[PDB]
Amino acid sequence: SDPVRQYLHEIGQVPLLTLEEEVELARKVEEGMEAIKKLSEITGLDPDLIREVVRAKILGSARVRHIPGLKETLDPKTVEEIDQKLKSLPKEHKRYLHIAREGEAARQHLIEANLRLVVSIAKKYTGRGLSFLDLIQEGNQGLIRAVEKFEYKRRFKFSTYATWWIRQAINRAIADQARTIRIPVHMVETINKLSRTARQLQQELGREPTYEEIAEAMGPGWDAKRVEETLKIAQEPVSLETPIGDEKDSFYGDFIPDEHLPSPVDAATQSLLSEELEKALSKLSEREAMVLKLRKGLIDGREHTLEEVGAFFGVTRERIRQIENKALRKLKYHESRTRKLRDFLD
Amino acid sequence: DQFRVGLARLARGVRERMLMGSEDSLTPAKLVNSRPLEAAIREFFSRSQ
Amino acid sequence: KARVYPFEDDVEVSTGDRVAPGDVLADGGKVKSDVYGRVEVDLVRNVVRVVESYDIDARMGAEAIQQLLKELDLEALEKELLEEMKHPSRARRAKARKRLEVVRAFLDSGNRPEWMILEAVPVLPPDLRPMVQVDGGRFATSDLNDLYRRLINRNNRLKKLLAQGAPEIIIRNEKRMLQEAVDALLDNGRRGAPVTNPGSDRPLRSLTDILSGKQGRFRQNLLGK
Amino acid sequence: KEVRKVRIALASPEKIRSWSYGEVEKPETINYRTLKPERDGLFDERIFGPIKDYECACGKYKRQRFEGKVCERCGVEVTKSIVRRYRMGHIELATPAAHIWFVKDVPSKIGTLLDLSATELEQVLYFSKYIVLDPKGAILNGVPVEKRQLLTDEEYRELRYGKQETYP
Amino acid sequence: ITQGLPRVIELFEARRPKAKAVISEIDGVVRIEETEEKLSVFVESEGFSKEYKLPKEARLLVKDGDYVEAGQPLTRGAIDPHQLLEAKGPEAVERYLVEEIQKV
Amino acid sequence: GKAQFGGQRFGEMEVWALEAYGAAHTLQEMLTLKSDDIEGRNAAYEAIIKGEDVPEPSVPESFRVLVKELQALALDVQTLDEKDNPVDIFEGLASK
Amino acid sequence: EKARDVKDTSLRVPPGEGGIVVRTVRLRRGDPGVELKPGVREVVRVYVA
Amino acid sequence: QLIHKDTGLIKEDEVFLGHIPLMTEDGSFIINGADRVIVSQIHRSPGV
DNA sequence: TGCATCCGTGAGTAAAG
DNA sequence: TATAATGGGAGCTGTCACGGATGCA
Ligand SMILES: [Mg+2]
Ligand SMILES: [Zn+2]
């Protein structure tokens, strides 16, 4: 029913390691990575493709997919080919294959054994914009990174090194996903520094700070205008389905008018403008009207240069400019006489 | 009642900061985020039925 | 519960492989497989261990359900249900009628049952879920965008957890979360808790809610405006 | 032509992809500084269309002479902006997901087709029990595994990965 | 004293009323059987016999040894329209619904 | 609303009133030319300021929104003709 | 005539309203005691009797 | 006051929690410049 | 073949808000 | 990037009637 209860149960299935089992699993992981290095040395294959093949066989045919970094599409055919090229090795060479397989199995069991630590850390990051489960999964990603980077030779328990990458992944996800308008990680850091600074200023000032006080407390390079611009850029959107009034009757978005689509008055005024422009252009000859329509973009949407209109009509650019000028002059005279286009100039 | 709810949220934040942090230097000012209480009261007075 | 088979020469199967009775384990084919199980090559002990287990295909989720639905031969089922319609017990006739109704709906329509399972999820045009600047420079936006963002974050993290070979508990959790993300996108509130925005008890407004009710599309904007 | 009927039917993944003009790959809406849509996000003009009539995102093509042209620099068609109300996109899922309408609208159409009760369809769909598609000659608790059988997690692990235990 | 808008709704939805009257599934003649503790009514055809057991204080619209039509009311109260439909047919139910609605 | 220079709501029951009168054309005006037939409302305003009779309306935009919101639920909704051949109410603007 | 850079967005009297102006309040960013929400340069209020 | 149980250290301070709206003389409030009134609510009394 | 029991769903219009 | 850290909190409640699916005896 409750998905977090279900995941907590599945987590409570795998038992917690003893120091010996932890050291053993970590050791097998390290030696398996070394063995994949050695198998790349021998076979001259790609270390990542080798790792993917060993992983594919350890997990089963249940999961097989194309990996982004690999140059070849990872399907059971090619994994069988590579597994056969591996199985045709001498004993002291083929030994590294068993090493790598056991290392991958240890990797899986180490992650599964330490899945509870992720939960016990992530429970303290709720309410920052991410679901509990979302935090748990991002922490599990951190746990996978920790497993792949751990060094058992340092004699540190695994929890210590894993907590670092777990916090890292949780905080990266909070910084990368919480906002509907995405903000770069460094800008989120600056925004939260501003928040904490203003909260300290209010906790010492007995009131909310002004922009200038926050600029003071922020140091050099910070003035009131920059605090204001940072607060402006940090503003989060609001829901169009926000309730208005105390019934379930109206949404906030219902009062927002559409500025994009033209109003019927706008469309009609554009139509009357085009028709009056054709009216005034019919008082010119066909050539001066066509030159004006070409030079202003009413024919094909774009404005032509004098050289293009002159090449189209077969005249010099000075002549096409002169007939454009006389067309404009006739239009100015007709407009002064009839005043049929003034009101459209707003 | 709304004050009590804001206080409960403030206390959750307080314990959150108590678990971590340099426990040599932790003042009351370093543990109290007044924002949840402020928000609860502001909500009651602006958008309550 | 395993079966031991020591070896003296080059072994032919590696750790993790699935073994059936009659499979060659090691020593050029001399030592072979007795029971069904999974191969644990022990180089310390120089024995090829086999822990008894079947290669059983048992899945979870909409992937399993989609497989089964693809596997339905509709005419065959129609025949079985017609035979069931001749049964004395009224309950069995009733159930076979209720099932045969769905079967014949799919048959006469030309819709594949598996289509009730989504592989590609459609995305509404952006103007129908706007992101608009209200008078004064702030932004207002539809809830569908946050539902789609939940969906896309969880789907992307699933693709990465797969590409990075994650354990089964984790992939299972991700897949559960993905199904629930889709469910909230389409009919938020229907199963389980309704998805809310942070710092608010208000349920987000999904596609079903846009379609139905007093304020739904039909009654609010199509049968009257 | 004149509209006379309106049909409604299920849509295949191929049909849904036929509607889509692009896959939405990033959970991002618009850029916090430019206030322009992000690439491969929910508002991308490459997918859904131009924001301004007959004008691509960068600005290379800005009149009606270009119609249907897809800009090479930014990839936005030059048509009317009204199309941002009509052009679908799609999300390609890693794992298929059930359309809740066909699950929770009792009696469930899926669960009726497969003779699966509401509880069983819930348990399989939200990852609480396995279901067998091939037993590969498995045997559980003295009876062989029949297809479409509901195994708990303990049972599936005992069958697929064998029995064992460790004692201190 | 009426039932009003709830009665109209109970009719338009064809809901089996709470204070439902009992009707005869067949024709026949009536034979009452009333112990001081229990009460029943029997409708007897020329080869058939139906038994309608009902609580003690129910008001009867029937006199002993009378000839009742199939679907005729025996108890007082509102007739179940679906029982009327099975016993007496569509025209009977149409008459009943129209008249009962018009009463309000 | 008056503050938004808004229009009156002609709701479900007002529609029933127009139906019971058999004012098919008055009703169709309410549903298209006066509310959300974009081309229709523009063309009506232009015809009236020119002195012409108002044009025959076309599809209300909210029905197009309904079609697209059903597509968003993986339901294919298809306007057909009497020959059961699809009709495009989107005028090609959303078919590749 | 060149098209001016700006456009008329003035606050006019809505339909069916009006009267006699009796108060104007003006607040500007950079003025003593005054701080508006981020972004706004100035706020003007007119009271009509 | 903060107290570490083992250390015995006791640090004390008066912290600022924000503002509480005051009620005017006539029993009303002033929230964001507009007078508001909190309406008493009737409910089932606790008990058995 | 019959009942109790549970889950889902709907519960007036316009106005202002 | 390294002390060790390993299973969560919030429910929140004066209808109501029906219809249809599930559950028992
Ligand atoms: Mg400064
Ligand atoms: Zn471009």
Curated annotation (Swiss-Prot), chain E:
It comes from the Bacteria. DNA-dependent RNA polymerase catalyzes the transcription of DNA into RNA using the four ribonucleoside triphosphates as substrates. The RNAP catalytic core consists of 2 alpha, 1 beta, 1 beta' and 1 omega subunit. When a sigma factor is associated with the core the holoenzyme is formed, which can initiate transcription. Belongs to the RNA polymerase beta' chain family. This is DNA-directed RNA polymerase subunit beta'. It comes from Thermus thermophilus (strain ATCC 27634 / DSM 579 / HB8). The chain holds residues 1252 to 1355 of 1524 of the full protein.
Swiss-Prot record, chain F:
It comes from the Bacteria. Belongs to the RNA polymerase beta chain family. This is DNA-directed RNA polymerase subunit beta. DNA-dependent RNA polymerase catalyzes the transcription of DNA into RNA using the four ribonucleoside triphosphates as substrates. It comes from Thermus thermophilus (strain ATCC 27634 / DSM 579 / HB8). The RNAP catalytic core consists of 2 alpha, 1 beta, 1 beta' and 1 omega subunit. When a sigma factor is associated with the core the holoenzyme is formed, which can initiate transcription.
